[PDB]
DNA sequence: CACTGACTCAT
DNA sequence: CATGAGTCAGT
């Protein structure tokens, strides 16, 4: 019971471990598009303030 | 020194838990946003495949 | 001396 | 079976 404990907390904090490693680059490429996608936007519209439409998030 | 390692233990798993929660949070605020910029794109420019620029990132 | 990985216990 | 917390060992 012990033995297969001791696999299950291994398990759960590498789930955890990469869980962490996962959401730490997503965080990363979603805010790398949001800057490809407001630069776009503002390439095609160079009228628009997208800035004060869609405010930015901290990071 | 057992009573110091007792809070060490639970700051390093609050900011584990922390981070992890965090990152998660900007990853999700940084999504939502993506999906408006996107879709002001759309009705600013309806005839543009967006997808094909700038592909939607794999959550 | 504080931080963190990993084992154990109790949920 | 998965996980929050105390503990020990190593960083």
Redesign the pocket.
């Known amino acids: 019971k012990?033995?297969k404990?001791?696999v299950?907390?291994?398990?759960?904090?590498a789930?955890?471990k990469q869980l962490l490693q996962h959401y730490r680059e997503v965080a990363a490429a979603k805010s790398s598009e949001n800057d490809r996608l407001r630069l776009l936007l503002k390439q095609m519209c160079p009228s628009l303030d997208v800035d004060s439409i869609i405010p930015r998030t901290p990071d």
């Open positions: 012990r033995y404990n001791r299950a907390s291994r398990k759960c904090r789930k955890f």
